[PDB]
């Protein structure tokens, strides 16, 4: 619903001859998806990594603490892929990352 | 390229043409190490460790039995060339371990 409202506002701005960046600000979200997060870790963009303790098959995340330690990224193992899925509007999430937040946070 | 002699036999035999140099075909890049592949392989080696036959060859190389290590590596892997490359790789692992210690 939020994305639909944002796209309606951007369509209105395009209709009145304005760029979508004029009516939309830079977003700040929890980063998720295992391939995406591994890319962010390798590019050293991730500031904090949270890994679910119960990923099956375990090989999908078994290298993640070593990768984070090599890149100097703070990580923590947390209980609940379902709990991380509640963060990212999914049933489950293997890993979440924070790259950047707002100034008040 | 060496110019051909224009003769049917001998060294550098064959009809004379103007040989061109070619930009190398991208299919011939296979075997080259890329940075990401090297990084991922080093991390996976650190995570997974060694195989038991690799531990045996490392023990032989530490004790200095190089010919025994080569023979055992050939028996384990199958060919002399693969055994030689594996022994060089494990000697490198030993050298980095010693330079760390």
């Amino acid at each position: 619903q939020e994305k639909k409202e944002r796209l309606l506002r951007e369509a209105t701005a395009i209709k009145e001859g304005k760029k979508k960046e004029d009516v939309s600000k830079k977003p700040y979200t929890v980063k998720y998806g295992l391939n995406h997060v591994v890319g962010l870790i390798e590019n050293k963009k991730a500031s904090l990594v949270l890994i679910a303790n119960d990923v099956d098959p375990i090989e999908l995340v078994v290298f993640l603490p070593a990768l984070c330690r090599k890149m100097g990224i703070p990580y923590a193992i947390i209980k609940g892929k379902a709990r991380l899925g509640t963060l990212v509007h999914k049933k489950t999430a293997a890993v979440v990352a924070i790259t950047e937040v707002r100034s008040e946070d | 390229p060496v110019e051909r002699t224009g003769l049917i036999r001998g060294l550098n035999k064959g009809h004379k043409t103007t040989r061109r140099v070619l930009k190398e075909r991208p299919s011939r890049r296979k075997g080259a190490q890329s940075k990401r592949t090297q990084f991922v392989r080093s991390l996976i080696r650190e995570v997974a460790g060694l195989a038991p036959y690799e531990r045996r060859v490392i023990e032989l190389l530490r004790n200095g039995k190089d010919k025994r290590a080569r023979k055992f590596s050939k028996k384990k892997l199958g060919t002399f060339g693969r055994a030689k490359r594996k022994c060089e790789e494990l000697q490198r692992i030993i050298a980095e371990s010693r330079r760390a210690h």
Partner: peptide, 8 residues
């Protein structure tokens, strides 16, 4: 940092 490719 480790990059898969150059990015825009």
């Amino acid at each position: 940092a480790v990059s898969v490719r150059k990015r825009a």
